[PDB]
């Protein structure tokens, strides 16, 4: 077994800085004077992309903001300068001997200025109400940092059951995050209350951002 | 070189998963031709078939896998027997060079295979339009009650929210922001493709 242990698990870096990620192998991944240790970038919905091969060689077609060093059991990937498009997971992988294995990945976050979310609330569609269901949706878009919490209130009372919250991966252009919150009720439950509110707690405000609507108003 | 995976979206437990990689722009009689998979959480190496037809398999999969090829079609194939929920993953094909280029240099886009006894269900697509106006307007679509993954939403300033599983069905959503001078005066439609059910739903956003 050759285990590749990456460090750190995640890291946050500013635009223009030099970022370094480590890969430590449990046994040497060298043979014939070569280190069969390579580095990849992977973004959501995309395959991995080869950045560096044989520990220190830049893959043709990749811009020279990536470099690598090391031999035997300790390796480093350097991203310099860090750009917004570098928001991704980075993996090391070896192919020196059986079994070939990958590291577990290091998530790179791009630091950017603090940004409050743009909050939009949506009532259930007439189409969904025709089928007996009622989903209320809140989009919290283009915010930073990622830590944000949404609270649903139905007639001013907190509702935890029936909520699904989903975050995007970090934006490759503006380094923000977005998230969607959906409160799903039955049409009968929905029609027994009038006030629907989503409240967003974030470090950018002492008081939450509140978006609301009143049913059939 | 370009690689492209093809195979089923859903396979029942205990059945055989069969995938094809179609290679264009280079011959499979040079290089190494690999399979790799990414689990829902981890990347795992599956195996290769070489330029001369010799194989190399992940030792934990050697009793269940077979990699074969057809040099006349420039295709290579993966067979994985007796699949379980643990084989649900995105499967990729990738090219490797020899000792001077031993990285995985070229990859296919990947294909998600879900191992489950559940039936394929197409999505319900609900429009998200503001209730009863600024310089911009955010619209969306709520995509509910489908199985298995994935769906692609095209508008036609977009955010795609990853799907979440609840009581056996997936829910995802997508938002789009446009100038208020372009909607509702021009059409805005979300097109939701669900390859596993061969269904596309193209929902128009109404004010």
């Amino acid at each position: 077994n050759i285990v590749l242990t990456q460090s750190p698990v995640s890291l946050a870096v500013s635009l223009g800085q030099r970022a370094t990620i480590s890969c430590r192998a449990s046994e040497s991944v060298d043979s014939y004077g070569k280190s069969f240790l390579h580095w990849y970038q992977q973004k959501p919905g995309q395959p991995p992309k080869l950045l560096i091969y044989l520990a220190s060689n830049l893959e043709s077609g990749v811009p020279a903001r990536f470099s690598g060093s090391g031999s035997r059991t300790d390796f480093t990937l350097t991203i310099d300068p860090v750009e917004a498009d570098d928001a991704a997971t980075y993996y090391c992988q070896h192919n020196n001997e059986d079994p070939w294995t990958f590291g577990g990945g290091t998530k790179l976050e791009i630091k950017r200025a603090d940004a409050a979310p743009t909050v939009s609330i949506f009532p259930p569609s007439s189409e969904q109400l025709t089928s007996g269901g009622a989903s209320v949706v809140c989009f919290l878009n283009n915010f930073y940092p990622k830590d944000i919490n949404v609270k649903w209130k139905i007639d001013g009372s907190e509702r935890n059951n029936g909520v699904l919250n989903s975050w995007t991966d970090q934006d490759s252009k503006d380094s923000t995050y977005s998230m969607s919150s959906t409160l799903t009720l039955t049409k009968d439950e929905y029609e027994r209350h009038n006030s629907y509110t989503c409240e967003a707690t974030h470090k950018t405000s002492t008081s939450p951002i509140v978006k609301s609507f009143n049913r059939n108003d | 070189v370009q690689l492209q995976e093809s195979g089923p979206s859903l396979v029942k437990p205990s059945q055989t998963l069969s995938l094809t990689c179609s290679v264009t722009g280079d011959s499979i009689t040079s290089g190494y031709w690999n399979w790799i998979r990414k689990f829902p959480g981890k990347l795992e190496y599956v195996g290769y078939i070489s330029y001369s037809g010799d194989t190399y398999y992940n030792p934990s999969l050697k009793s269940r896998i077979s990699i074969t090829r057809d040099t006349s079609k420039n295709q290579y194939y993966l067979q994985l027997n007796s699949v379980t929920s643990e084989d649900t993953a995105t499967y990729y094909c990738a090219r490797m060079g020899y000792g001077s280029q031993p990285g995985f240099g070229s990859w296919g886009q990947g294909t998600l295979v879900t191992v489950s006894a559940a039936k394929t269900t197409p999505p319900s697509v609900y429009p998200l339009a503001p209730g009863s106006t600024g310089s911009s307007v955010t619209l969306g679509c709520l995509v509910k009650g489908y199985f298995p993954e994935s769906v692609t939403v095209t508008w036609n300033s977009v955010h795609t929210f990853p799907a979440l599983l609840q009581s056996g069905l997936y829910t995802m959503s997508s938002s789009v922001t446009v100038p208020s001078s372009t909607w509702p005066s021009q059409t805005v439609t979300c097109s939701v493709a669900h390859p596993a059910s061969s269904t596309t739903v193209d929902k128009k956003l109404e004010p």
């Binding site: 043979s31 014939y32 069969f36 192919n95 059986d98 079994p99 | 190399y56 020899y98 031993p102």
Partner: peptide, 10 residues
Amino acid sequence: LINTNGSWHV
């Protein structure tokens, strides 16, 4: 170098 059975050799 070429690969056989996961290892590189001349």
